[PDB]
Design a protein around this ligand. Sequence first.
Ligand SMILES: Nc1ncnc2c1ncn2[C@@H]1O[C@H](COP(=O)(O)OP(=O)(O)NP(=O)(O)O)[C@@H](O)[C@H]1O
Ligand SMILES: [Mg+2]
Lengths: 413, 413, 567
Amino acid sequence: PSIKPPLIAVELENPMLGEVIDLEETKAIVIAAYENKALALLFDYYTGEIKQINRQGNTYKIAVSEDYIGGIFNGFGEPIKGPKPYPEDYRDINGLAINPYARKVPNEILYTGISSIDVAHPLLKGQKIAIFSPPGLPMERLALQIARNVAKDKTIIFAAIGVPSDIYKMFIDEFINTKAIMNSAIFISKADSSPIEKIYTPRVALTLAEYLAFEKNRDVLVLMLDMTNYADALREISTLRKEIPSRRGYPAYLYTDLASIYERSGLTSKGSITLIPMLTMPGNDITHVVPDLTGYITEGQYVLSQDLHSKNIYPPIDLLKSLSRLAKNGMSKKHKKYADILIKSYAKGLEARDIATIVGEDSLSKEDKAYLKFAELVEKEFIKQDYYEYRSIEKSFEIIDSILSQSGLPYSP
Amino acid sequence: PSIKPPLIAVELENPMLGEVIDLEETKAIVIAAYENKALALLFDYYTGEIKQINRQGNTYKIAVSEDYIGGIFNGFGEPIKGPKPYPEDYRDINGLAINPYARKVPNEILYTGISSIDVAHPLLKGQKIAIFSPPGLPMERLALQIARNVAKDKTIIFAAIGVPSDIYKMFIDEFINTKAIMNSAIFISKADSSPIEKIYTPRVALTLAEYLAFEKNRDVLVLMLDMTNYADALREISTLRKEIPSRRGYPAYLYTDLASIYERSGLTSKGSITLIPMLTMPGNDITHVVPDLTGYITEGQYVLSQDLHSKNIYPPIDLLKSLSRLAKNGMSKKHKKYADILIKSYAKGLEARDIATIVGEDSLSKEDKAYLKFAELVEKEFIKQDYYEYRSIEKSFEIIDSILSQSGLPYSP
Amino acid sequence: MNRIISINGPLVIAKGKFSIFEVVRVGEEKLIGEVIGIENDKAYIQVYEDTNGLKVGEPVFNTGKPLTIELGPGLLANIFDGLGRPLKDIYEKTQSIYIPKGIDLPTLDRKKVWEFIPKKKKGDTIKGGDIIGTVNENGFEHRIIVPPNVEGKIEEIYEGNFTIEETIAIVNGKPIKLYHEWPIRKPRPYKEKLDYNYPFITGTRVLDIMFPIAKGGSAAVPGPFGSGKTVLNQQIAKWADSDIVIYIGCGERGNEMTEVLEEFPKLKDPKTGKPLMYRTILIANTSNMPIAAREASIYLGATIGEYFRDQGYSVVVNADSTSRWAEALREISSRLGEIPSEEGYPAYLLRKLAEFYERSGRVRTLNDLEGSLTIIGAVSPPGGDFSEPVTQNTLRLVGALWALDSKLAYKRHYPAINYLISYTKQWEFVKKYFEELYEDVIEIREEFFAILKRESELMDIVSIVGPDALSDNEKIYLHMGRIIREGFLQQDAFDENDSYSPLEKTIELMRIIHKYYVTVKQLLGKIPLEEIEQKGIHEKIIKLRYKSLKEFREEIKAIEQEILSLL
Ligand SMILES: Nc1ncnc2c1ncn2[C@@H]1O[C@H](COP(=O)(O)OP(=O)(O)NP(=O)(O)O)[C@@H](O)[C@H]1O
Ligand SMILES: [Mg+2]
């Protein structure tokens, strides 16, 4: 045998890829299968000898039911507090790819009550949209605020991936306060956990999400964080094999693996899964492999601005870098017009802000100071919004019409 | 045995490096020789088993004669249409290095009729000069135009390396139209061909070129494209071995290998080989390994400008980035003066164009708007020239004297 | 006696007797795979299904032929996966929304009853690729072309109603079906590659005037995420002047394939009035579907494109996106223990890409008819850096670069085509079409390029000088450029009147902007540009593309009249 935590090497007769094997206390997942040799990842910290090994007949599967709702579990789906859900009907945590023929394209807006989102980049039911945040910005507060307003009739699933105690407890205590923890399931992998637990965290959460939404007829909201911690965990497992690394050590199949998670969402005739993956952009570089690949997969993204945050603005959402691909599907003619006037005028306002660095402010075109005024008010009145303030879509429109009026731009009254 | 196209592995008694071995239909080249083991590259797509193997006593050689003139062949020199040249006197396609003692330094200008070339950077007989082009610029049209005017009494050899059908057919149909295909030989390796065929394409072409020019007493013009496709082909073969890669996977001996091709040209007492290698600069980066190494080998280069092309200027030759090292050898005192006044004034015109971004045009030195006018007219009257327009060297001089006059600069009359 | 000896992702190594490109059934579930390498008694197999849960000792079942595709009636208006398996049938046969592991369904409908009308009589001699008859496929004349293999005299030929397996003719002792199977890794034969002759007319102005390709040409569409690759490709798939449209969903989002399924049946072909779906074929191997089938989908769609081309039809293939194919190749190469080349990709990446784009071209078919296959390839460069291998390799294979700009997408300037970096290498082959039918647009095109180029140069001076501190001989380019950009280059894919732009509308926009241009130029010094801009017009031209065919043509007259110069 061979053992260096959390990895072990052992001989097996006819090794199965992904096979679960049993030791004394802990389990393990076979991640490599040569001829008689096999590499396996321990579920946790194991001190004992790798002597007796019991081989389960299948890969890792979880029993699905509505018992997970209201409970807190680890990355393996196992209950932390207590006390084991109904062990009926086990499902492979990897699941299956959804037939695009059986899909329905999201067309219904889930209003968040957040102006910087609902107007220009609204979230739709069954949509997968991500949050891109530089280190240190209130990414967690934004997601929590969203979950309050869009999941009052929905089940929330939170997959905590390698996040510190400070982070996941913030979610838990907030689901408790808003009484939304009884209608939610939480899966948590600690920062010190085995890499096999971390990568299983989003899979077990989505396997339950698919069950609740497509076998039972429910609308599900799934949140996960941090996807950058997920990639680190996946790279750790990728390294333990002979696998030839891509850039920065990341596995060359990072896109496909991420896609195997982000694509496990959508809208059908029976139910829906709205997924919001969250990630920290390393060095605030959106071209980094994790935010880049994620943007190539998710149906848009909400980008947090390091500049807006320095201006004491919450939520620090960048209106121009952010995007909602399916937004057009759920927007009315009046809604489309407001998003258009908001985006193009704010963008023009930023252009006038750039030339203000050249020719001083107050020494420029008398429409360029109008767009300049517009951009400022948008940041300080439209984008800026309290963590406990909910705005109707009409209210957000009124703010725009107000700002347009103050800036000397054409407004609708 | 072992087989994954276009590579095979097999046992041989006493393996010879570069040895040609025979299968059922196709042949192969041994590219690696350990003890009893050998790695070989298939000539093309082969489905059969690697059973019976007939070993030719030597490396790849071609029979040389003047029969190639007027015919179209593949990268191996084999006739595509028909129908086998006189199989007499076989030559190793690698050839031999020319004794620099036996060389004569090029001193005779081959006038192209193209102002942007003949004046400042003229091509000489026996000279090796390359064309550097960003993706999408009329590099092929430039070479074709050159071949019309400089090879009316010469044999043209065209080595097509991995270029699409659109490209090599453009050459063929153009040699047909100008009746110059009867006095030319064409060697073509398709983009899907074996990498061994692609790297053999320039070698078989030059082996014939050396025969026609140095055994028969002829002046030969060799054109090849694309050298960037050649490097890719060479890297593919370099990878198939245990070879430790340099940057971007390219073999560490890329310079020497390229030199083994570019140096197979020159002038003697009997004949000459004028070689024009063509390459696409990846990402329009002249510091990329292929254009960089090529510039370290060729005796100058004609650099196509992405800016001039956007100005609807053909040929988009950059007068300042381009160079002809041996140009001085064939230039008269009057010719040297015109190149000098052209280069330094155009360069000064560009300097005045840069400061025009600072202080506006019309608000500068009244000699700086002169050089500014000069640079513009040079681009729009001197450099810009029709694909079917031939200019004598005197005509090109007159344009310069005309431009100098219009710009308020000293001219010769 | 075959035995799996290893399972490494999509790669399975097995013991036994195999062939170099033979399809195999991997494991007890008989998962479709393909041998790609043989090292002694071993065979290297890429599995087009999920390899998770595979045991070592499991068997590997041999088959006769290679990877093929059924070429006949039953493809149009349907969606298939990477292996050409019907996704509508999969859904119904399984009653699930998920895609099963190792489902085995026939490609063409086996029960659908077609009406066959022969174009040849008894006793006639037949060649390969000969039209033996036609089948009406929901308004489309599907020409039953016999395989290139088939030659001889017609001993019997039938007429009327038949299914896809029923014999419709007998030639030299052998039965002729309404379909045949062709290896997708094998380019279908043709007589002669023809010269470029006709411009490939999409519905999008920038791709029809600024950087057009010829019918049978090829183009690359690279850009970062959110730039507009999918929408641009879908817009081409919607309005392109083409007999057959093939959209390949290569390793991308599922919803976008569904998006086509919802909108295309609702839309009408401008050239025929018929619903767009009846000319459309969908190949869908989404991002989280088997990665090895991404490659298969590329070759599959290409073979189908050649098939309809061989009927003497014009076919267009949109591949969204080719980078996902490259990722698949990169993955196989890794597991195979191959040495990586540039950026991890195998050293044979360029040649592999060539096996796709080289299939394009306007050709002389075996039956001496004229057909063309136009291939549009989307590239997804990491970080939006175009210097990456895939993009760069592609640019030395295709006829034009339709580059999408991150800066323009940021401005919501759609399509985000970088008019400075983008190019076409096929303008000289298509200008003849325009020189004849619209002689004045050659000048206007050069004019639009020149204006955009001059506006570009002026932007450096502006940022460190001031936009209003310029002369009116300079400010005109900023003025005209904005009109060209917001009025001509931009095109709202999700607007009813703007989504499709016929050449009539496109040329009229060019003519009216040019007519406005020469008016302003001969008004300099006399009337300042500031005063001119106050009289609207420039804003009215911009909004022209949003108006209907009727509202547009009259507003043009209004603008022409509103241009009176003498004031
Ligand atoms: N012609 C257009 N008109 C209006 N909006 C457009 C147009 N083209 C693109 N867009 C918008 O651009 C956004 C991104 O489009 P999309 O094609 O998905 O980007 P992409 O990342 O480059 N391609 P892909 O990754 O394959 O989906 C969408 O939300 C569209 O609304
Ligand atoms: Mg996509």
